[PDB]
Structures are given as structure tokens and as C-alpha cells.
């Protein structure tokens, strides 16, 4: 998911 | 949101509308008068609120009816229908809570669950709460699966799941109230450091990032508006699209330069023709002045024609001197118009070698989040779960994530070191054949009404199979398995005796040298109490770094940290661990991603249960026997802990409905 | 509806860059050579104009004739009438040119002259011979 992106 | 409406939100439900699932269980209400629906919706929301306000104790139908008001507490069968529905589908009384009614004297039905990861554990707890006989078969010597937590002394670092991605609507919010999770917020500030080891100036930092965000939107535009989704029969990946977008931005940079210098030549060529006219006029003026001079040298007295000559040539000379001055006027205007255009040129390049490297870090970050090379991600669908993202700050579990699976594992029949080899399912029941992981010849046989399979997608993908299904899984299921992507990302845990980094910086990046190695040790985490730094290996790097020893890996880790903090401020690490998730036989990767050619619909297919053929031909259509939970089965929350957790809840509900029957559907 | 402002992405441009495997590098080279072509064309015409500028050095300063201011007179001297007849022969209907040649006659006085001395200075014949050139 895009959610993990820093 | 707050109150009853906030409870529906915290439970991922619209507060003022009935869901498809509710429509199935209450087709009398949703097809009925709007007034009744609002009574239903309030009852639902109020019950949710009650459970959410206090998640450490079971919420009974009695306790619920007690705290309801008129006219909502008048129809007690409606309240019971609702309460049961919410209990069955694990919206209330899920996780770890004190039971008011001690578990029923005798169990009903028998379920074998493969894997004691979070999805497995969640379902098991539910099924036990429903009064079923449940046994989990774990291949590892521990529970948790992809929730792995390194422990040694005071050092605590997650090699698997690490971040709780916001508490707004997160089932993990409920869990964190039931379990002592030390949840600490993450400061999103991430300073970058180039290959040399020096910070990227806030000028570049902000302008490259903006370009990244802009490049993303551009791909989205390419997808929906320009419908650029199939190229040479093959589906377009996010990587392909980003490349195409960048090329067109380099193309524009050149197109701009071409027409700018094209303006200069047209003006310089206007000047060329004007100067030719001026040279051809200063030539005729030169000759005409000579003629007038010779006419004036004829001293008088002179006749009228000779007088006319002098006058005529005088008029003609001032007439040509008029033109030349009007042309020197024009020359002055075109000559400064060329100093205008040559002063401010368009952009020289789209992105420099320094720029493109920092842009690659941003790609690496995206490759980390999706645990995969951007060339594998679906252009159209890679971000299909964005709409369901939770609200609030992202948090880390400071005492290690394992505290959660372990807490869920309490009071459950879990056979560790038990590798399932074969699943046999027939109209009359199921047998699961497992071996002992230590001495592989020692064989076990398990007989059950139902099997819940929580095998990772990487495991399910193995060829030749690690687990054999008898009969073989249907084509529609196996195609979903092949289509879906199962990514990879790794972690390097570095334990020191002293903090030599910025204690208020949670994460800092490192910019690689090449596109090829952008994922390699590109990010570092400072999240834990003890002096621990955690380094990510993403993208194409993750897969390759697994064929490299820990010493060499930690070598490159120290090298990078030395370049950033000082070659003598970085001591030797006391303890080091390096994960290898693709190599791990009980994972065969890290977590699923929407591969190119796949969609969110494949996740649905993965969750669909299997019903065996009849034993006796002509015998009635059998009960479904093989069920699937897990991270790769939940369309709206894949590749996460909460998603796994939820899929377990989903299956436990579906299985209980099948084997204990639904009393609430009347 | 539209690309992010500053991003350039047209349907036509996408098809061109993805026509084949190296259609991307082909297009970017044809523009790189077009840029070199136009850039060296700039220095060429810059050199041509640099040479033409040196030929115009000095301007037309040693060729300018000082301003002659004279007040407009109403009387036609025999001299002035004769200048006029020749100015018609050389300029035709350019009343401004004729006025400057004579020196002290307004453009209207010249126009009047045409009508006044019409038959006596055969201005019909003088104008028809001017047209013959
Ligand atoms: C490096 C990394 C970081 C992550 N970080 C996050 C994060 O920050 N936030 C987040 O929400 N999610 C994160 N995830 C994903 C999350 O950890 C998983 O999605 C989730 O734990 C999967 O749960 P599961 O029960 O579906 O699968 P698993 O936890 O893999 O459970 C499957 C179980 O089956 C067992 N098994 C396998 N084969 C057999 C067999 N033949 N017989 C018996 N048992 C078998 C396995 O040992 C395992 O215990 C991360 C994953 C990785 C790899």
C-alpha cells in the first residue's frame, strides 16, 4: 500500500 | 467525528446508510420504510459505541438492551438481531476481552486453521468464542508469522510489521486498548543525504519532491484521462508510465528551446534584411552627396537649370537621410529585442544527474511502500486502497509488534513446528496432513469439518507446490494466485551502545548512486528507546541483497552512516540482524501488491471459499469446506496487519454462519 | 480534466514516444540535432550581421546637410516659377518634394500654382512627359 511511504 | 456517528466511522461503516452485508442479513429492514432503517442504523451505531467505549469486557445483548432508550429499546428482537450480527462479523467482542458468559460446556464443529499469523489467530479466537473446536497448525516455532520481532537484552526491533498506519477507523485501535502496545507517533520529517554524505539543500529537496508528486498525478492522468493502460497487448506498469511521463517532460524542455532559438533567428534575419537596406542606402547617400557637392562647386552666377540641380539634389539627399534615420530607429528596436530574448532563455535541462538521483530516492520510497519494483505495479490499480486509508498519525509499537500475536495466542490449541503438506477436502469433510519440521518423517493427520487456509501468497505461489490440494484448486483460484503480485522488502537492525544521530529525527534517507541501486539501504529508522537504527532495503535491491552476507550488508550500512555523521562517530554495532523474506520458506516474500494485469477483484477471488464435488454422483450440492483468510484476501486493506486481522474476523464469521447457522437472519 | 500545471501530456505525444522500443530516444535525438542545427545557424547570421554593421560605421554624418530655415513667401519670383516647372518635370504630383525644392512655398501654394499657371506653363504637357519615365 501507499500508506507505508515515508 | 464523535458520538454514535463516530462509532460507525471507527468501525469503517457509513453512519447514515446500510451496507451490502447488512442488506443481506436484514432484507426486511433495508427494503422497508425509511423510518425503520434509521432505528436500525441507530441501534447498530449505539451498540458499536458501547463496545468501543469499553473494549476490555464482552458486550452482551443484556448489557446492550439495558443502555438503549425508547423507541429504540421497544423492539427487543431487532436489538437481538443487530447484536448477534455485530458479534458474528466481529465488529463487537473481537480480540482480547473478559468473558461474562464462560464458554459453552460442549463444542460444535471442528476447524483446522493453517498458520498462526495474525489472520489465523484472529479467526481462531472468534471461532472459539462461537463454541467451535479449533486447532492452528504453525510451521514456525513461534506465532505471529510476518509479525516478527527481534529481542535481545533491551534491544527490541521489528523485522516484519512495524507501523500502525493511523488509529482513525483502525481495528488495531481497539486491540491497542486491550493489549499493552507502547504506541509512539512518528515525526514525518525526513532529511536526505546524497552519495557523498552531505544533506540535500532545502532548495533542491522541496523542488524535487514537488516534481515527484507532480509526476505521480501525471501517471494518474495518463491512466484515467488518456486511457494509457495497454501497450503491445501487455498491461502498462507504473514504472513504464513514469518513464513515458519523464520523457515527455524532457521532450517539452527541448521543444521550448527549439522555438526560443527559432524566435532569435527570425529576429536576427529581420535585422539582416534591414542592414542590407541600410548599406544599400548609405551607398546611394555617398554617391548623391558627391553629386550635390559637384553641383555646388559650380559657383554662380548660374542659369536656372544649374540652380535647380543644386536644389533638387539637396531635397533628394535630405529625403534619403530621412529614410536612413527611420531605419536606424527600427535597427535600435530590433537590436534590443534580441538582447531581450538572449537574456532570459527557457530551461536548460528537465532534471540534472544530481536531480535525477534524488528523484530516484522518492521512487525507492514508493518501491518500499509497495515492496516491489515500480515496473511490476499496475498503473490503473496500484493505489486502489487509497480511499480506505485511516486518519491520524502513524505510530510504531515501541515494545515490539509480537506482543500482539502472542496476546491473541493465549488459550488456543496451536501446534508449532507443524508443516502442512497436503489439504484433502471432500463432501463429507476434510483431512490435513502435516509433518514435524524437525524430524520430517513423523507424520500427523487432522480430521475436520472445515479448513481455514492462511498461507501467504508467496507460499500459495510455490512451484513445485509446498502444499498440495486434493482435489486441485480450481483454475479461477490458481489464476488469481499467479496474477497477483507478492512483493519483497528487507530490514537491517543495527544495535549500538550510544546515540550518534539526531534524537528528534525518526527517519532519514540516503540517496543512492544509480537508478539500479536506489532501494539499497535508502532509509533509516530511529524509533525505539534503545540505541537502534533500522535500515530498509527496497525495490530491485531487496531481492539481490539476500544473496549477500550480513557482514557485507552491515559494512555498507556503516559506510553510509560514517559519511553522514562522521567517520569516527559511528562505532561498531553490538548486535546485527538481516531479514530475508523471499528466502523464508514460510513467507516466500513480504506482502502482496497489485501487479500489472491484476486488480482489486483478484483479492475478492482469493477470499472466495471452495466447495468440493459430491461423493456419490447425484447427491445434493455440498457445504463449502476450504476457506481463505490473510493479508492477500482483503481487497480494501491488503498488505497490512489490520487487513489480515480483519480477514480472519471475516472468515470466522462466514464459517460460523455455515456450521452453526445464522439465527439473526429471521 | 487537465494535466498538472507545468506537466505536458497530449494524446498525440504519448503515441509518438511509445510507437516502438526506441521511439523515445529517436524523438529526443531528432530534437537534439534540430537544436544544434538552429544554434549554429544563429552564430552564422550573427557573423553576417557583425560584418554588415562594420560597413555602416560612421553612419551618415559626413553626408548630412545643415538645416535651412526660410519663411514662407506669397510672391512668385520669375526664378521661383522656373524652379517649379522643373520640379514638376522631375517629381510630377509630389507637391511636398516641389515645395522643398523651391524652399519658400507652402504645399497649398504649390497646388494653387498648378491651377493658376496651368495654360501658361503647359503643365498638362509637363506632367505627361513625367509619366513617360
Ligand atoms: C518487512 C515487512 C514489514 C511490514 N510492515 C508492516 C507495517 O508496518 N504495517 C502493517 O500493517 N503491515 C506490515 N507488513 C505486513 C504484515 O506483517 C502482514 O500483512 C501480516 O502480518 C500478514 O498476516 P497473515 O496472517 O495474513 O500472514 P502471516 O503472518 O504470514 O501468517 C501465515 C502463517 O502461516 C505459516 N505457514 C506458512 N507455510 C506453512 C505450512 N506449509 N504449514 C503451516 N504453516 C505455514 C507461517 O509461518 C505464518 O505463521 C509488513 C510485512 C513485511 C514483510
mmCIF file of N, CA and C in Angstrom, chain B residues 271 274-283 324 331, chain C residues 49-60:
data_model
loop_
_atom_site.group_PDB
_atom_site.id
_atom_site.type_symbol
_atom_site.label_atom_id
_atom_site.label_comp_id
_atom_site.label_asym_id
_atom_site.label_seq_id
_atom_site.Cartn_x
_atom_site.Cartn_y
_atom_site.Cartn_z
ATOM 1 N N UNK B 271 16.837 41.668 -38.933
ATOM 2 C CA UNK B 271 17.959 42.589 -38.806
ATOM 3 C C UNK B 271 18.877 42.499 -40.023
ATOM 4 N N UNK B 274 17.354 44.392 -42.881
ATOM 5 C CA UNK B 274 17.349 45.822 -42.590
ATOM 6 C C UNK B 274 18.739 46.431 -42.767
ATOM 7 N N UNK B 275 19.770 45.689 -42.363
ATOM 8 C CA UNK B 275 21.154 46.136 -42.527
ATOM 9 C C UNK B 275 21.564 46.186 -44.001
ATOM 10 N N UNK B 276 21.067 45.234 -44.789
ATOM 11 C CA UNK B 276 21.268 45.234 -46.240
ATOM 12 C C UNK B 276 20.656 46.465 -46.889
ATOM 13 N N UNK B 277 19.461 46.827 -46.436
ATOM 14 C CA UNK B 277 18.780 48.027 -46.901
ATOM 15 C C UNK B 277 19.560 49.280 -46.493
ATOM 16 N N UNK B 278 20.111 49.266 -45.280
ATOM 17 C CA UNK B 278 20.885 50.392 -44.757
ATOM 18 C C UNK B 278 22.227 50.575 -45.464
ATOM 19 N N UNK B 279 22.906 49.468 -45.755
ATOM 20 C CA UNK B 279 24.154 49.503 -46.523
ATOM 21 C C UNK B 279 23.911 49.993 -47.956
ATOM 22 N N UNK B 280 22.809 49.552 -48.560
ATOM 23 C CA UNK B 280 22.426 49.989 -49.904
ATOM 24 C C UNK B 280 21.910 51.427 -49.967
ATOM 25 N N UNK B 281 21.639 52.011 -48.802
ATOM 26 C CA UNK B 281 21.183 53.394 -48.725
ATOM 27 C C UNK B 281 22.348 54.334 -48.426
ATOM 28 N N UNK B 282 23.202 53.943 -47.481
ATOM 29 C CA UNK B 282 24.441 54.668 -47.201
ATOM 30 C C UNK B 282 25.357 54.671 -48.431
ATOM 31 N N UNK B 283 25.104 53.753 -49.360
ATOM 32 C CA UNK B 283 25.829 53.707 -50.623
ATOM 33 C C UNK B 283 25.311 54.777 -51.579
ATOM 34 N N UNK B 324 17.013 56.785 -43.826
ATOM 35 C CA UNK B 324 18.096 56.151 -43.070
ATOM 36 C C UNK B 324 17.933 56.327 -41.562
ATOM 37 N N UNK B 331 16.338 49.668 -36.422
ATOM 38 C CA UNK B 331 17.517 48.888 -36.037
ATOM 39 C C UNK B 331 17.738 48.893 -34.523
ATOM 40 N N UNK C 49 25.721 39.583 -39.764
ATOM 41 C CA UNK C 49 25.288 40.896 -39.291
ATOM 42 C C UNK C 49 26.398 41.706 -38.624
ATOM 43 N N UNK C 50 27.377 41.015 -38.043
ATOM 44 C CA UNK C 50 28.543 41.669 -37.451
ATOM 45 C C UNK C 50 29.403 42.357 -38.515
ATOM 46 N N UNK C 51 29.480 41.741 -39.693
ATOM 47 C CA UNK C 51 30.217 42.295 -40.827
ATOM 48 C C UNK C 51 29.480 43.476 -41.462
ATOM 49 N N UNK C 52 28.158 43.352 -41.602
ATOM 50 C CA UNK C 52 27.325 44.420 -42.165
ATOM 51 C C UNK C 52 27.274 45.654 -41.268
ATOM 52 N N UNK C 53 27.455 45.450 -39.965
ATOM 53 C CA UNK C 53 27.486 46.550 -39.003
ATOM 54 C C UNK C 53 28.757 47.385 -39.128
ATOM 55 N N UNK C 54 29.868 46.731 -39.462
ATOM 56 C CA UNK C 54 31.151 47.416 -39.601
ATOM 57 C C UNK C 54 31.188 48.301 -40.850
ATOM 58 N N UNK C 55 30.424 47.916 -41.870
ATOM 59 C CA UNK C 55 30.298 48.702 -43.099
ATOM 60 C C UNK C 55 29.465 49.967 -42.895
ATOM 61 N N UNK C 56 28.601 49.954 -41.882
ATOM 62 C CA UNK C 56 27.784 51.117 -41.537
ATOM 63 C C UNK C 56 28.437 51.990 -40.463
ATOM 64 N N UNK C 57 29.729 51.780 -40.221
ATOM 65 C CA UNK C 57 30.452 52.559 -39.217
ATOM 66 C C UNK C 57 30.703 53.986 -39.699
ATOM 67 N N UNK C 58 30.376 54.946 -38.839
ATOM 68 C CA UNK C 58 30.420 56.360 -39.191
ATOM 69 C C UNK C 58 29.025 56.920 -39.414
ATOM 70 N N UNK C 59 28.090 56.039 -39.762
ATOM 71 C CA UNK C 59 26.710 56.425 -40.047
ATOM 72 C C UNK C 59 26.612 57.175 -41.359
ATOM 73 N N UNK C 60 25.869 58.276 -41.349
ATOM 74 C CA UNK C 60 25.810 59.182 -42.497
ATOM 75 C C UNK C 60 26.149 60.620 -42.078
#
